[PDB]
Amino acid sequence: AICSALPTIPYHKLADLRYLSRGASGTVSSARHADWRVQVAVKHLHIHTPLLDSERKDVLREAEILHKARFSYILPILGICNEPEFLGIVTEYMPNGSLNELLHRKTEYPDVAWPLRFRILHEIALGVNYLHNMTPPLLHHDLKTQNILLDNEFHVKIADFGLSKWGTIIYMPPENYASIKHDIYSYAVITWEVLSRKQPFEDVTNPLQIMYSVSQGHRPVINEESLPYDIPHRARMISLIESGWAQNPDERPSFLKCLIELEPVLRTFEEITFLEAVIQLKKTKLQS
Ligand SMILES: CNC(=O)c1cc(Oc2ccc(NC(=O)Nc3ccc(SCC(=O)O)c(F)c3)c(F)c2)ccn1
């Protein structure tokens, strides 16, 4: 068959290395490739010497998986740095951060237009659906707003800042306190979070109260105050959320079924309204 090797990038080709304030502190950095002349991001362990050989294989495993899963809506890996001095994963740089920031930093982004929100939800489904259609199927099991990255034109790139795979319980289905019905549950909560710009279980301080409540069937509140009546396709989106976070995992739809129903919804938006939505947030961000 047709096989292709991932490039090995020398450490001294990464210029202007700077820490980034994301993921675990001291695990994500930005830089520039001296030859390709593009901005990049570098994911790495905490800095120490010597790097264990068991630690190197942990990084190569994540890199091999991200290499196998290359797709239009998945964070593109560019290569790996494997030397005695440094050990990291180099990917493309997403300039506009994560969906977490866009939703809840209401001063930098006072308004987020509906067409952009619906396209974001659409592209999130496209990336995960591609992961599930692989052989063997790839399961994320960590879908949250912090893992949804946005590129130069606010297109979705799905990523994973965690390191152990190779508050934070609000995206977990109740049966958790193999297993393909996990990601669609996280997606239902993200959909509610996008359409509301509110924190799920805002007034609940103790996480044990959250875990107990969702185990009894309680979900984030859906009323006029959380989801106003002027949301486009409000009735159809609520049916998707409620079926997405169903108590019984067998009653949750696949990401394919969601995409089939999302296609006619997104089609009712004019194509130009997407660009005008992106030009607006970048304009409001100019004066800040
Ligand atoms: C302001 N802009 C930024 O700060 C920025 C930082 C940035 O840093 C990184 C973030 C993540 C990763 N790595 C990663 O996403 N790996 C991975 C592995 C398996 C799966 S498959 C499903 C699953 O298992 O979750 C998957 F989807 C993803 C990385 F290498 C670098 C990248 C872009 N922009």
Side-chain angles (χ1 to χ4, degrees), residues 1-60 62-151 153-179 181-201 203-256 258-279 281-288:
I2 294 179
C3 300
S4 192
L6 194 56
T8 297
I9 301 189
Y11 183 52
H12 75 269
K13 297 294 179 184
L14 301 174
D16 313 294
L17 261 179
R18 302 180 89 174
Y19 265 169
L20 279 169
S21 292
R22 269 178 227 279
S25 60
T27 58
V28 179
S29 306
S30 74
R32 271 184 162 274
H33 202 291
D35 292 328
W36 308 343
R37 317 298 297 185
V38 297
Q39 270 194 299
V40 298
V42 185
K43 183 180 175 177
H44 55 86
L45 303 172
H46 284 95
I47 304 174
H48 60 264
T49 42
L51 295 154
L52 307 173
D53 276 7
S54 50
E55 295 173 336
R56 293 186 190 266
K57 299 179 302 177
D58 294 354
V59 180
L60 295 167
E62 179 186 355
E64 179 166 60
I65 291 185
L66 192 50
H67 189 42
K68 288 165 134 65
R70 262 182 160 273
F71 189 62
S72 304
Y73 304 95
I74 305 294
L75 176 62
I77 185 176
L78 297 182
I80 61 102
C81 183
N82 186 16
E83 281 174 313
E85 272 60 39
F86 196 72
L87 165 72
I89 294 171
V90 181
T91 73
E92 288 184 2
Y93 176 80
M94 297 294 109
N96 288 322
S98 59
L99 188 59
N100 184 35
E101 310 165 342
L102 176 63
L103 292 180
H104 306 302
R105 291 182 180 176
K106 301 182 180 174
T107 302
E108 297 159 50
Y109 310 99
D111 289 319
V112 191
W114 296 115
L116 183 62
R117 296 198 211 183
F118 281 83
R119 188 183 74 182
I120 291 184
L121 296 178
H122 185 204
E123 302 180 334
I124 293 171
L126 281 159
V128 180
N129 172 80
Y130 184 85
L131 291 181
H132 290 179
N133 283 268
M134 294 176 55
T135 55
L138 271 189
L139 312 178
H140 194 301
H141 291 359
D142 211 335
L143 278 175
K144 47 187 171 179
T145 56
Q146 290 103 292
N147 283 334
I148 308 306
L149 298 186
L150 303 166
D151 71 359
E153 285 83 20
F154 282 90
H155 288 288
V156 166
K157 256 69 180 183
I158 290 170
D160 195 318
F161 286 102
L163 304 87
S164 180
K165 276 180 159 51
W166 300 276
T168 57
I169 50 94
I170 65 184
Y171 303 108
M172 185 172 296
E175 66 262 21
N176 260 240
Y177 22 83
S179 69
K181 298 296 185 172
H182 182 349
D183 292 335
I184 191 61
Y185 184 95
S186 308
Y187 179 81
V189 181
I190 292 174
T191 303
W192 180 95
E193 186 167 357
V194 168
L195 301 178
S196 66
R197 300 191 78 181
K198 306 182 85 64
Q199 203 73 46
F201 308 108
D203 294 319
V204 184
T205 58
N206 186 26
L208 290 180
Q209 304 178 266
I210 299 180
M211 298 171 58
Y212 177 87
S213 299
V214 302
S215 71
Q216 300 301 294
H218 289 265
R219 299 295 183 272
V221 186
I222 296 182
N223 56 24
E224 141 103 68
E225 197 219 32
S226 60
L227 299 174
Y229 286 156
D230 64 315
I231 297 178
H233 306 271
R234 181 186 187 275
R236 185 172 279 97
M237 298 299 289
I238 289 179
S239 310
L240 182 136
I241 296 176
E242 270 158 5
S243 56
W245 66 22
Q247 190 77 11
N248 184 21
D250 296 351
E251 309 186 74
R252 298 170 195 161
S254 69
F255 276 92
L256 171 60
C258 304
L259 283 171
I260 295 179
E261 192 157 303
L262 282 173
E263 286 170 358
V265 171
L266 267 297
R267 214 168 284 149
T268 63
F269 297 95
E270 298 278 62
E271 188 227 354
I272 296 195
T273 65
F274 299 102
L275 274 306
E276 315 190 283
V278 177
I279 201 65
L281 351 156
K282 282 187 182 242
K283 267 184 175 184
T284 67
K285 207 160 78 179
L286 293 179
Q287 52 206 164
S288 305

mmCIF file with all atom_site columns, all heavy atoms in Angstrom, residues 15-35:
data_model
loop_
_atom_site.group_PDB
_atom_site.id
_atom_site.type_symbol
_atom_site.label_atom_id
_atom_site.label_alt_id
_atom_site.label_comp_id
_atom_site.label_asym_id
_atom_site.label_entity_id
_atom_site.label_seq_id
_atom_site.pdbx_PDB_ins_code
_atom_site.Cartn_x
_atom_site.Cartn_y
_atom_site.Cartn_z
_atom_site.occupancy
_atom_site.B_iso_or_equiv
_atom_site.pdbx_formal_charge
_atom_site.auth_seq_id
_atom_site.auth_comp_id
_atom_site.auth_asym_id
_atom_site.auth_atom_id
_atom_site.pdbx_PDB_model_num
ATOM 1   N N   . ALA A 1 15 ? 12.279 28.870 15.396 1.00 0.00 ? 15 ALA A N   1
ATOM 2   C CA  . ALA A 1 15 ? 12.722 30.184 15.834 1.00 0.00 ? 15 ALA A CA  1
ATOM 3   C C   . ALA A 1 15 ? 11.629 30.889 16.631 1.00 0.00 ? 15 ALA A C   1
ATOM 4   O O   . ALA A 1 15 ? 10.439 30.594 16.498 1.00 0.00 ? 15 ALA A O   1
ATOM 5   C CB  . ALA A 1 15 ? 13.129 31.042 14.632 1.00 0.00 ? 15 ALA A CB  1
ATOM 6   N N   . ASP A 1 16 ? 12.059 31.837 17.465 1.00 0.00 ? 16 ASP A N   1
ATOM 7   C CA  . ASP A 1 16 ? 11.168 32.634 18.312 1.00 0.00 ? 16 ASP A CA  1
ATOM 8   C C   . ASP A 1 16 ? 10.271 31.745 19.173 1.00 0.00 ? 16 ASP A C   1
ATOM 9   O O   . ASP A 1 16 ? 9.047  31.888 19.194 1.00 0.00 ? 16 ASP A O   1
ATOM 10  C CB  . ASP A 1 16 ? 10.323 33.598 17.475 1.00 0.00 ? 16 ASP A CB  1
ATOM 11  C CG  . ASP A 1 16 ? 11.140 34.361 16.452 1.00 0.00 ? 16 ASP A CG  1
ATOM 12  O OD1 . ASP A 1 16 ? 12.000 35.174 16.854 1.00 0.00 ? 16 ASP A OD1 1
ATOM 13  O OD2 . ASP A 1 16 ? 10.923 34.145 15.241 1.00 0.00 ? 16 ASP A OD2 1
ATOM 14  N N   . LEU A 1 17 ? 10.891 30.813 19.895 1.00 0.00 ? 17 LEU A N   1
ATOM 15  C CA  . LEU A 1 17 ? 10.135 29.942 20.786 1.00 0.00 ? 17 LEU A CA  1
ATOM 16  C C   . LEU A 1 17 ? 9.603  30.736 21.973 1.00 0.00 ? 17 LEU A C   1
ATOM 17  O O   . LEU A 1 17 ? 10.357 31.447 22.646 1.00 0.00 ? 17 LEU A O   1
ATOM 18  C CB  . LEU A 1 17 ? 11.005 28.783 21.271 1.00 0.00 ? 17 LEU A CB  1
ATOM 19  C CG  . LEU A 1 17 ? 10.840 27.452 20.537 1.00 0.00 ? 17 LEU A CG  1
ATOM 20  C CD1 . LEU A 1 17 ? 11.778 26.398 21.106 1.00 0.00 ? 17 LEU A CD1 1
ATOM 21  C CD2 . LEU A 1 17 ? 9.395  26.983 20.617 1.00 0.00 ? 17 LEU A CD2 1
ATOM 22  N N   . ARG A 1 18 ? 8.300  30.620 22.221 1.00 0.00 ? 18 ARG A N   1
ATOM 23  C CA  . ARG A 1 18 ? 7.644  31.298 23.330 1.00 0.00 ? 18 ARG A CA  1
ATOM 24  C C   . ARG A 1 18 ? 6.629  30.354 23.954 1.00 0.00 ? 18 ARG A C   1
ATOM 25  O O   . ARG A 1 18 ? 5.988  29.563 23.257 1.00 0.00 ? 18 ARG A O   1
ATOM 26  C CB  . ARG A 1 18 ? 6.938  32.590 22.882 1.00 0.00 ? 18 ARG A CB  1
ATOM 27  C CG  . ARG A 1 18 ? 7.844  33.618 22.223 1.00 0.00 ? 18 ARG A CG  1
ATOM 28  C CD  . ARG A 1 18 ? 7.075  34.869 21.815 1.00 0.00 ? 18 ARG A CD  1
ATOM 29  N NE  . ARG A 1 18 ? 7.018  35.864 22.885 1.00 0.00 ? 18 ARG A NE  1
ATOM 30  C CZ  . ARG A 1 18 ? 6.509  37.084 22.743 1.00 0.00 ? 18 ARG A CZ  1
ATOM 31  N NH1 . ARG A 1 18 ? 6.006  37.464 21.575 1.00 0.00 ? 18 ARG A NH1 1
ATOM 32  N NH2 . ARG A 1 18 ? 6.502  37.927 23.769 1.00 0.00 ? 18 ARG A NH2 1
ATOM 33  N N   . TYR A 1 19 ? 6.490  30.438 25.276 1.00 0.00 ? 19 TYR A N   1
ATOM 34  C CA  . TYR A 1 19 ? 5.429  29.709 25.955 1.00 0.00 ? 19 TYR A CA  1
ATOM 35  C C   . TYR A 1 19 ? 4.062  30.181 25.469 1.00 0.00 ? 19 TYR A C   1
ATOM 36  O O   . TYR A 1 19 ? 3.883  31.333 25.064 1.00 0.00 ? 19 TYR A O   1
ATOM 37  C CB  . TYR A 1 19 ? 5.524  29.904 27.469 1.00 0.00 ? 19 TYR A CB  1
ATOM 38  C CG  . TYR A 1 19 ? 6.281  28.828 28.220 1.00 0.00 ? 19 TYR A CG  1
ATOM 39  C CD1 . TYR A 1 19 ? 6.633  29.011 29.554 1.00 0.00 ? 19 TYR A CD1 1
ATOM 40  C CD2 . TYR A 1 19 ? 6.634  27.630 27.609 1.00 0.00 ? 19 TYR A CD2 1
ATOM 41  C CE1 . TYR A 1 19 ? 7.319  28.041 30.260 1.00 0.00 ? 19 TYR A CE1 1
ATOM 42  C CE2 . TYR A 1 19 ? 7.324  26.647 28.307 1.00 0.00 ? 19 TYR A CE2 1
ATOM 43  C CZ  . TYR A 1 19 ? 7.662  26.862 29.634 1.00 0.00 ? 19 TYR A CZ  1
ATOM 44  O OH  . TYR A 1 19 ? 8.347  25.898 30.340 1.00 0.00 ? 19 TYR A OH  1
ATOM 45  N N   . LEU A 1 20 ? 3.095  29.271 25.506 1.00 0.00 ? 20 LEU A N   1
ATOM 46  C CA  . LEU A 1 20 ? 1.696  29.587 25.267 1.00 0.00 ? 20 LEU A CA  1
ATOM 47  C C   . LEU A 1 20 ? 0.896  29.291 26.529 1.00 0.00 ? 20 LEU A C   1
ATOM 48  O O   . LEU A 1 20 ? 1.219  28.363 27.280 1.00 0.00 ? 20 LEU A O   1
ATOM 49  C CB  . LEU A 1 20 ? 1.136  28.791 24.080 1.00 0.00 ? 20 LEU A CB  1
ATOM 50  C CG  . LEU A 1 20 ? 1.441  29.341 22.688 1.00 0.00 ? 20 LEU A CG  1
ATOM 51  C CD1 . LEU A 1 20 ? 1.061  28.330 21.623 1.00 0.00 ? 20 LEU A CD1 1
ATOM 52  C CD2 . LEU A 1 20 ? 0.693  30.643 22.474 1.00 0.00 ? 20 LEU A CD2 1
ATOM 53  N N   . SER A 1 21 ? -0.139 30.094 26.770 1.00 0.00 ? 21 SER A N   1
ATOM 54  C CA  . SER A 1 21 ? -0.987 29.926 27.952 1.00 0.00 ? 21 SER A CA  1
ATOM 55  C C   . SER A 1 21 ? -2.190 29.044 27.612 1.00 0.00 ? 21 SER A C   1
ATOM 56  O O   . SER A 1 21 ? -3.346 29.464 27.598 1.00 0.00 ? 21 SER A O   1
ATOM 57  C CB  . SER A 1 21 ? -1.419 31.282 28.495 1.00 0.00 ? 21 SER A CB  1
ATOM 58  O OG  . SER A 1 21 ? -0.323 31.999 29.036 1.00 0.00 ? 21 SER A OG  1
ATOM 59  N N   . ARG A 1 22 ? -1.892 27.774 27.372 1.00 0.00 ? 22 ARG A N   1
ATOM 60  C CA  . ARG A 1 22 ? -2.915 26.789 27.073 1.00 0.00 ? 22 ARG A CA  1
ATOM 61  C C   . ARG A 1 22 ? -2.490 25.448 27.634 1.00 0.00 ? 22 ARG A C   1
ATOM 62  O O   . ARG A 1 22 ? -1.328 25.249 27.971 1.00 0.00 ? 22 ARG A O   1
ATOM 63  C CB  . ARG A 1 22 ? -3.158 26.698 25.576 1.00 0.00 ? 22 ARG A CB  1
ATOM 64  C CG  . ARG A 1 22 ? -4.231 27.625 25.115 1.00 0.00 ? 22 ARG A CG  1
ATOM 65  C CD  . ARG A 1 22 ? -4.424 27.551 23.632 1.00 0.00 ? 22 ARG A CD  1
ATOM 66  N NE  . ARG A 1 22 ? -4.491 28.897 23.083 1.00 0.00 ? 22 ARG A NE  1
ATOM 67  C CZ  . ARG A 1 22 ? -5.584 29.650 23.110 1.00 0.00 ? 22 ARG A CZ  1
ATOM 68  N NH1 . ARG A 1 22 ? -6.698 29.179 23.653 1.00 0.00 ? 22 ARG A NH1 1
ATOM 69  N NH2 . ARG A 1 22 ? -5.560 30.873 22.591 1.00 0.00 ? 22 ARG A NH2 1
ATOM 70  N N   . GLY A 1 23 ? -3.444 24.527 27.719 1.00 0.00 ? 23 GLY A N   1
ATOM 71  C CA  . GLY A 1 23 ? -3.245 23.183 28.239 1.00 0.00 ? 23 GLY A CA  1
ATOM 72  C C   . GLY A 1 23 ? -2.590 23.195 29.604 1.00 0.00 ? 23 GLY A C   1
ATOM 73  O O   . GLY A 1 23 ? -2.765 24.120 30.405 1.00 0.00 ? 23 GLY A O   1
ATOM 74  N N   . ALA A 1 24 ? -1.824 22.143 29.878 1.00 0.00 ? 24 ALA A N   1
ATOM 75  C CA  . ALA A 1 24 ? -1.012 22.117 31.084 1.00 0.00 ? 24 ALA A CA  1
ATOM 76  C C   . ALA A 1 24 ? 0.101  23.151 30.973 1.00 0.00 ? 24 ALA A C   1
ATOM 77  O O   . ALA A 1 24 ? 0.704  23.324 29.909 1.00 0.00 ? 24 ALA A O   1
ATOM 78  C CB  . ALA A 1 24 ? -0.429 20.721 31.301 1.00 0.00 ? 24 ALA A CB  1
ATOM 79  N N   . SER A 1 25 ? 0.360  23.853 32.075 1.00 0.00 ? 25 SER A N   1
ATOM 80  C CA  . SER A 1 25 ? 1.348  24.927 32.069 1.00 0.00 ? 25 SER A CA  1
ATOM 81  C C   . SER A 1 25 ? 2.722  24.383 31.702 1.00 0.00 ? 25 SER A C   1
ATOM 82  O O   . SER A 1 25 ? 3.224  23.453 32.341 1.00 0.00 ? 25 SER A O   1
ATOM 83  C CB  . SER A 1 25 ? 1.388  25.611 33.433 1.00 0.00 ? 25 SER A CB  1
ATOM 84  O OG  . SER A 1 25 ? 1.729  24.694 34.460 1.00 0.00 ? 25 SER A OG  1
ATOM 85  N N   . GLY A 1 26 ? 3.323  24.959 30.665 1.00 0.00 ? 26 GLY A N   1
ATOM 86  C CA  . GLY A 1 26 ? 4.627  24.519 30.211 1.00 0.00 ? 26 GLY A CA  1
ATOM 87  C C   . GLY A 1 26 ? 4.624  23.335 29.270 1.00 0.00 ? 26 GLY A C   1
ATOM 88  O O   . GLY A 1 26 ? 5.645  22.650 29.163 1.00 0.00 ? 26 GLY A O   1
ATOM 89  N N   . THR A 1 27 ? 3.510  23.069 28.581 1.00 0.00 ? 27 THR A N   1
ATOM 90  C CA  . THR A 1 27 ? 3.450  21.976 27.620 1.00 0.00 ? 27 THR A CA  1
ATOM 91  C C   . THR A 1 27 ? 3.167  22.412 26.186 1.00 0.00 ? 27 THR A C   1
ATOM 92  O O   . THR A 1 27 ? 3.279  21.580 25.278 1.00 0.00 ? 27 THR A O   1
ATOM 93  C CB  . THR A 1 27 ? 2.391  20.942 28.041 1.00 0.00 ? 27 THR A CB  1
ATOM 94  O OG1 . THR A 1 27 ? 1.112  21.575 28.151 1.00 0.00 ? 27 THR A OG1 1
ATOM 95  C CG2 . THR A 1 27 ? 2.760  20.311 29.373 1.00 0.00 ? 27 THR A CG2 1
ATOM 96  N N   . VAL A 1 28 ? 2.813  23.674 25.950 1.00 0.00 ? 28 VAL A N   1
ATOM 97  C CA  . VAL A 1 28 ? 2.484  24.169 24.616 1.00 0.00 ? 28 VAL A CA  1
ATOM 98  C C   . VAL A 1 28 ? 3.305  25.424 24.344 1.00 0.00 ? 28 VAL A C   1
ATOM 99  O O   . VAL A 1 28 ? 3.387  26.316 25.195 1.00 0.00 ? 28 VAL A O   1
ATOM 100 C CB  . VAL A 1 28 ? 0.978  24.467 24.468 1.00 0.00 ? 28 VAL A CB  1
ATOM 101 C CG1 . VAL A 1 28 ? 0.669  24.999 23.073 1.00 0.00 ? 28 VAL A CG1 1
ATOM 102 C CG2 . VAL A 1 28 ? 0.157  23.220 24.758 1.00 0.00 ? 28 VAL A CG2 1
ATOM 103 N N   . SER A 1 29 ? 3.902  25.495 23.156 1.00 0.00 ? 29 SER A N   1
ATOM 104 C CA  . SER A 1 29 ? 4.707  26.641 22.758 1.00 0.00 ? 29 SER A CA  1
ATOM 105 C C   . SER A 1 29 ? 4.407  26.996 21.311 1.00 0.00 ? 29 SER A C   1
ATOM 106 O O   . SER A 1 29 ? 3.878  26.185 20.547 1.00 0.00 ? 29 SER A O   1
ATOM 107 C CB  . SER A 1 29 ? 6.206  26.363 22.921 1.00 0.00 ? 29 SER A CB  1
ATOM 108 O OG  . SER A 1 29 ? 6.508  25.927 24.232 1.00 0.00 ? 29 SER A OG  1
ATOM 109 N N   . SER A 1 30 ? 4.756  28.224 20.937 1.00 0.00 ? 30 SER A N   1
ATOM 110 C CA  . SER A 1 30 ? 4.674  28.684 19.558 1.00 0.00 ? 30 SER A CA  1
ATOM 111 C C   . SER A 1 30 ? 6.072  28.982 19.041 1.00 0.00 ? 30 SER A C   1
ATOM 112 O O   . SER A 1 30 ? 6.997  29.219 19.819 1.00 0.00 ? 30 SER A O   1
ATOM 113 C CB  . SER A 1 30 ? 3.788  29.931 19.438 1.00 0.00 ? 30 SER A CB  1
ATOM 114 O OG  . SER A 1 30 ? 4.451  31.079 19.932 1.00 0.00 ? 30 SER A OG  1
ATOM 115 N N   . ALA A 1 31 ? 6.218  28.964 17.717 1.00 0.00 ? 31 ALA A N   1
ATOM 116 C CA  . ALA A 1 31 ? 7.508  29.224 17.082 1.00 0.00 ? 31 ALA A CA  1
ATOM 117 C C   . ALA A 1 31 ? 7.290  29.494 15.597 1.00 0.00 ? 31 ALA A C   1
ATOM 118 O O   . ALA A 1 31 ? 6.156  29.632 15.129 1.00 0.00 ? 31 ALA A O   1
ATOM 119 C CB  . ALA A 1 31 ? 8.476  28.056 17.303 1.00 0.00 ? 31 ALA A CB  1
ATOM 120 N N   . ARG A 1 32 ? 8.395  29.577 14.856 1.00 0.00 ? 32 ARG A N   1
ATOM 121 C CA  . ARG A 1 32 ? 8.382  29.751 13.413 1.00 0.00 ? 32 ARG A CA  1
ATOM 122 C C   . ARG A 1 32 ? 9.411  28.818 12.797 1.00 0.00 ? 32 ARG A C   1
ATOM 123 O O   . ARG A 1 32 ? 10.519 28.672 13.324 1.00 0.00 ? 32 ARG A O   1
ATOM 124 C CB  . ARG A 1 32 ? 8.690  31.196 13.007 1.00 0.00 ? 32 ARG A CB  1
ATOM 125 C CG  . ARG A 1 32 ? 7.468  32.089 12.916 1.00 0.00 ? 32 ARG A CG  1
ATOM 126 C CD  . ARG A 1 32 ? 7.833  33.477 12.409 1.00 0.00 ? 32 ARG A CD  1
ATOM 127 N NE  . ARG A 1 32 ? 6.659  34.202 11.931 1.00 0.00 ? 32 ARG A NE  1
ATOM 128 C CZ  . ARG A 1 32 ? 6.176  34.101 10.696 1.00 0.00 ? 32 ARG A CZ  1
ATOM 129 N NH1 . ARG A 1 32 ? 6.766  33.308 9.813  1.00 0.00 ? 32 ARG A NH1 1
ATOM 130 N NH2 . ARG A 1 32 ? 5.100  34.794 10.346 1.00 0.00 ? 32 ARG A NH2 1
ATOM 131 N N   . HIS A 1 33 ? 9.041  28.181 11.689 1.00 0.00 ? 33 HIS A N   1
ATOM 132 C CA  . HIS A 1 33 ? 9.965  27.321 10.962 1.00 0.00 ? 33 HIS A CA  1
ATOM 133 C C   . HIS A 1 33 ? 10.874 28.191 10.102 1.00 0.00 ? 33 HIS A C   1
ATOM 134 O O   . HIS A 1 33 ? 10.392 28.976 9.279  1.00 0.00 ? 33 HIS A O   1
ATOM 135 C CB  . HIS A 1 33 ? 9.200  26.314 10.106 1.00 0.00 ? 33 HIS A CB  1
ATOM 136 C CG  . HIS A 1 33 ? 9.998  25.102 9.741  1.00 0.00 ? 33 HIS A CG  1
ATOM 137 N ND1 . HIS A 1 33 ? 11.066 25.147 8.871  1.00 0.00 ? 33 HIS A ND1 1
ATOM 138 C CD2 . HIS A 1 33 ? 9.884  23.810 10.128 1.00 0.00 ? 33 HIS A CD2 1
ATOM 139 C CE1 . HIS A 1 33 ? 11.574 23.934 8.737  1.00 0.00 ? 33 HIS A CE1 1
ATOM 140 N NE2 . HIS A 1 33 ? 10.875 23.105 9.490  1.00 0.00 ? 33 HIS A NE2 1
ATOM 141 N N   . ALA A 1 34 ? 12.189 28.052 10.295 1.00 0.00 ? 34 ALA A N   1
ATOM 142 C CA  . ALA A 1 34 ? 13.135 28.948 9.636  1.00 0.00 ? 34 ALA A CA  1
ATOM 143 C C   . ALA A 1 34 ? 13.169 28.742 8.126  1.00 0.00 ? 34 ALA A C   1
ATOM 144 O O   . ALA A 1 34 ? 13.506 29.675 7.386  1.00 0.00 ? 34 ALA A O   1
ATOM 145 C CB  . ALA A 1 34 ? 14.532 28.759 10.225 1.00 0.00 ? 34 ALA A CB  1
ATOM 146 N N   . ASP A 1 35 ? 12.833 27.542 7.652  1.00 0.00 ? 35 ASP A N   1
ATOM 147 C CA  . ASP A 1 35 ? 12.870 27.214 6.230  1.00 0.00 ? 35 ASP A CA  1
ATOM 148 C C   . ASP A 1 35 ? 11.516 27.344 5.550  1.00 0.00 ? 35 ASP A C   1
ATOM 149 O O   . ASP A 1 35 ? 11.436 27.888 4.444  1.00 0.00 ? 35 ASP A O   1
ATOM 150 C CB  . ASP A 1 35 ? 13.395 25.789 6.029  1.00 0.00 ? 35 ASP A CB  1
ATOM 151 C CG  . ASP A 1 35 ? 14.854 25.647 6.403  1.00 0.00 ? 35 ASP A CG  1
ATOM 152 O OD1 . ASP A 1 35 ? 15.611 26.627 6.228  1.00 0.00 ? 35 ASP A OD1 1
ATOM 153 O OD2 . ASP A 1 35 ? 15.244 24.556 6.871  1.00 0.00 ? 35 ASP A OD2 1
#
